[PDB]
Design a protein around this ligand. Sequence first.
Ligand SMILES: [Zn+2]
Length: 178
Amino acid sequence: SGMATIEDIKETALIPFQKHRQLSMHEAEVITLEIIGLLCDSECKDEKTLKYLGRFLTPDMYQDLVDERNLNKRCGYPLCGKSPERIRDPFSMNDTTKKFLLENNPYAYLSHYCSKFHFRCSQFYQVQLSDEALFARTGVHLFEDPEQDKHDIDFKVTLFEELLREKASEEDIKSLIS
Ligand SMILES: [Zn+2]
């Protein structure tokens, strides 16, 4: 399918460091660019992968990912395979000016995402990410993690569309079956 799965992430980035619980600053780096290499031109298979992925990212690294997706002409949100609605020139000061000058204009997000909806999903995700550097997150890269359950909770991420779902009414629910 060409979509990143939790297994792709484990095989393509994590394999060479199942020797130690504690990563070097350099190792975390390698791991980082390996994941972003995986998600820069392709998308997450599903919400479980995007959620799993949170262990490995800081808000800033996610920002970088959104920028490199956009560069490869892709919606900032890693689950989306569409392109942004409006193009922007990274070296253009006009384009940079527009994002902040224009007051409550769609340009600001439609230049990074396919829609406001995915802008929201991307930002809802991002602000939950830890500022702790990856190498400081001892063990979160280990396949058979002795603290798997603990890391699952410490780096829990709730997706925006998980909250939207959770509130739907019975009348809403019923429509889908028919
Ligand atoms: Zn999108």
